[PDB]
Design a protein around this ligand. Structure first.
Ligand code: FE
Ligand code: MG
Ligand code: MG
Lengths: 305, 370, 305
């Protein structure tokens, strides 16, 4: 019941906030985002808090149809946090910024008493610049649009779950942490035909679709058979009765496009290193509902996390 | 103070210098030292390195000593303390750096004088020096050669509430020393302004601007404050000297206890109790002082014997500013000598921070060639 | 302690980081800064963590001679943290932003398990727009320039310490937290003549002077009888062995100006509500040393905290 985001929305109420975008669009051409990173454990299969802190903000800074350029990095560190772990985190941050073609230009470091923070938190903010004819917003979905996902669903969520709760599986699960600004850059070739871009992080794919529905004032239909998911994630969830639609991702983007450009958007993704498992997964409805079709045509509402 | 008529004459070394070394010295009573050949070129007295005219003077003389003795430094030796000007100047130079612990430097400055190059019992007593554990040192017994040191004995750490303020207002030093046993010193503590006291006790409790000290200088200050020699000084060590002058002739001492854990430790508060009891009984300052001096002499003697027993080492080095105290030096040399020790102290350079740079030089030199 | 900001410097080595500015100057035009706020207590005499979170960033965004416009706010909140406490913090933020003529345009909100954060941490990032002909940098100082301070020294540092540790003095000390963007704007009338602006936050005035010294390659002499201090702070320090130059300020700016324009800079500071206590406190010399002249002219070197 974190109705803290309701208190936030009341006090900082304005056009930018009401919009509920991945990033604010300022001056018409530059974008601004911020995110905190509180993941435990700090080091997990496929990544760490450092790579996460960069990628997430690089991603958020692109979701508006933008090339991310500059980042801030704020570190809040526990007294006596092992410095060799810190060197590893910082290194991972350096590597991710380099791959993303981004630079950390400002920052802060605060050290707090032992026990005032579990080891280390990191906040990053990001600045990006909009491409020529970019118009990407959670408000932009119209009925008839196609919904795509850039790759498999539920990697990160299940990976940190597995490491954090010591759950052994038949196959180890790795996090999908990646900067997607390169993939987004190739998508933004399609200009205005790209309508919505969002990374399904906290709350997974399900939450994104609902956010698209709420803000665009539309519905979304997805197809069970068309949803990409690694077998390791599939059976891990099937063992615990979890819906992978609710697990977080950190190397994926949900894309809404014009009907005629969907085939092109898929091929643009499939020809990119982080887009090999991309699929057309659904369609934007007239209904203000979020529904999933199984094999043979059995419709049911997607439940909210 | 080594200056006119002594400087710029160097200190002669037995072994020739491996590589040219510039020792920057410390803070108080600063001198620098350049090595070349069989000579360590220690500067004349420069003064406390805390002001512009002192620093300029310091710079100019380093350059002047280079020209006068054709020395070109290949490595800088500095004190471990991060806040000394001498340390910052050593930081700014585009040379490799060797940091040396203050009291290790003291002991080595005496060793250089007697061309010693072996593990010795180093008794370093002064006011302040930055220790390797981050705390203030000054009442140390070390097992050291010119390369490294092991810390075998010290006084129990006491809070020094307000740092430099407590060194001026030495009644604050007394408060830190007696802190965890306040109620016993009722008469002294009642005469502390109620507002200031509450602040001081909070300073200690919450560690605000309060260093933990092991320090012979501070020990003396606490005694001087408790027994009404002086509440406030006009210069560091004022209470120390006055306490030495008023002392009477006596053999009496106080009961002390040597607790062994990781290393040999002595609680000074345990000695202050008896000191205060004597003062409350109306005993003469002169008598108390005499007893206190003998207590220090006696516990240092007993500590030397214990260390000799466990290690086999028979050479004792006496250095640090405290040994400017004539009684403390004379008496300790004799007590130890009459017990079989080979005892060494400073003569060519001071036992105070004036001698630091010579010790810095020879330690950094052993490090390089070794 | 400060061994951490060192790791920060080496692994994020670029042209912006190495400049060590209050805020990065991007596109030759906009400023970017971030800062985290971890102060205890959350509510203190003369302000709170909310006011502080906004004001500190507004100020840093202004420090390159710029107008602050847009902020981000990120919250890291401990599970079970009273919502009524949070409304009050957030209200103070919205009022501060209102005063500084600024909007919170993007944010984040994270809830963590009990004992993982001590109540609430806030991070804020900010962007501002540079004024015309504004050339303000930590590198810009030169021999002959005049040093000035906006007001009384140490108010915040002592106020918060006094509230936290429950230290009783003859006069209670109140924080100075205030948005200075307005004073900065009126100061920027003399563009180009203004060389350095920096708020003496953690580390105090002493640290600012050492930062100007290291980065401009200059020395700074200050004069004791010219330093503005509140009597209650002078006394508080005198009782504790503390140098008021080491204490944090949150409503002050240190300003470095061309000799000829120094007088005009003081006057316009005196005409603003946050610069009535302002004073000319010294000058820039070629000595590469930071010194203070006490009463009767004694040139002590200023101690680094
Ligand atoms: Fe010393
Ligand atoms: Mg996002
Ligand atoms: Mg600043």
């Amino acid at each position: 019941g974190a109705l803290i985001e309701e208190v936030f929305a009341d006090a900082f109420d304005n056009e930018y906030i009401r919009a509920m975008e991945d990033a604010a669009l300022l001056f018409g051409n530059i974008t601004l985002t911020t995110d905190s990173f509180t993941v435990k454990p700090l080091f997990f299969p496929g990544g760490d808090i450092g790579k996460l802190a960069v990628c997430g903000t690089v991603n958020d800074a692109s979701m508006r149809g933008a090339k991310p350029l500059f980042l801030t990095a704020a570190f809040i560190i526990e007294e006596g946090f092992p410095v060799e772990d810190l060197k590893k985190i910082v290194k991972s941050m350096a590597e991710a910024a380099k791959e993303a073609g981004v630079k950390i230009v400002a920052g802060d470091t605060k050290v707090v008493e032992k026990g005032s923070v579990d080891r280390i938190f990191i906040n990053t903010s990001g600045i990006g610049v909009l491409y020529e004819g970019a118009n990407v917003s959670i408000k932009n979905a119209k009925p008839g649009d196609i919904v795509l996902i850039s790759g498999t669903i539920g990697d990160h969520g299940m990976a940190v779950m597995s490491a954090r709760e010591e759950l052994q599986f038949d196959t180890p699960i790795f996090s999908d942490v990646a900067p997607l600004n390169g993939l987004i850059e190739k998508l933004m070739t399609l200009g205005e035909a790209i309508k919505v871009l969002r990374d399904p992080t906290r709350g997974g794919v399900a939450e994104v679709l609902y956010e698209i529905s709420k803000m665009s004032g539309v519905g979304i239909k997805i197809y069970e058979e068309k949803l990409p998911v690694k077998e390791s994630v599939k059976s891990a969830c099937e063992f615990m009765g979890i819906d992978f639609l609710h697990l977080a991702n950190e190397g994926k983007v949900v894309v809404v496009v014009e009907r005629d450009y969907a085939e092109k958007a898929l091929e643009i993704m499939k020809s990119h290193e982080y887009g090999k498992d991309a699929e057309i997964i659904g369609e934007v409805n007239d209904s203000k509902l979020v529904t999933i079709n199984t094999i043979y045509g059995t419709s049911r509402i997607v439940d909210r996390p | 103070r080594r200056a006119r008529g002594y400087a710029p004459q160097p200190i002669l070394l037995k072994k020739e210098v491996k590589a040219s070394i510039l020792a920057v010295g410390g803070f108080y009573k600063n001198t620098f030292c350049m090595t070349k050949g069989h000579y360590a070129f220690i500067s004349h007295h420069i003064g406390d390195l805390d002001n512009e005219k002192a620093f300029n003077y310091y710079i100019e003389q380093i350059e002047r000593y280079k020209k006068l003795f054709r020395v070109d430094p290949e490595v800088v030796a500095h004190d471990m303390h991060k806040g000394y000007l001498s340390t910052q100047y050593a930081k700014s130079l585009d040379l490799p750096k060797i940091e040396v612990q203050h009291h290790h430097a003291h002991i080595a400055s005496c060793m250089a004088e007697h061309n010693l190059d072996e593990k010795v019992i180093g008794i370093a007593y002064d006011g302040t020096g930055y220790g390797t554990d981050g705390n203030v040192w000054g009442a140390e017994i070390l097992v050291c050669d010119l390369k490294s040191f092991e810390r075998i004995a010290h006084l129990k750490y006491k809070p020094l509430p307000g740092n430099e303020l407590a060194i001026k207002k030495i009644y604050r030093t007394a408060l830190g020393f007696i802190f965890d046993n306040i109620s016993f010193y009722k008469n002294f503590v009642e005469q502390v302004d109620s507002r200031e006291l509450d602040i001081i006790l909070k300073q200690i409790d919450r560690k605000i601007n309060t260093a933990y000290v092991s320090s012979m200088g501070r020990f003396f200050d606490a005694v001087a404050a408790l027994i009404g020699v002086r509440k406030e000084v006009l210069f560091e060590g004022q209470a120390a000297m006055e306490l030495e002058s008023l002392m009477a002739e006596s053999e009496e001492y106080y009961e002390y206890e040597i607790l062994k854990e990781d290393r040999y430790v002595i609680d000074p508060e345990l000695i202050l109790r008896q000191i205060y009891e004597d003062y409350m009984k109306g005993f003469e300052k002169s008598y108390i002082s005499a007893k206190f001096h003998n207590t220090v002499v006696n516990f240092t003697y007993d500590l030397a014997n214990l260390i000799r027993k466990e290690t086999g080492i028979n050479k004792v080095v006496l250095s640090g500013g405290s040994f400017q105290n004539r009684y403390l030096l004379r008496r300790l040399i004799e007590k130890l000598s009459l017990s079989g020790f080979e005892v060494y102290s400073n003569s060519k350079v001071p036992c105070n921070d004036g001698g630091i740079s010579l010790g810095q030089a020879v330690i950094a030199n052993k490090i390089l060639e070794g």
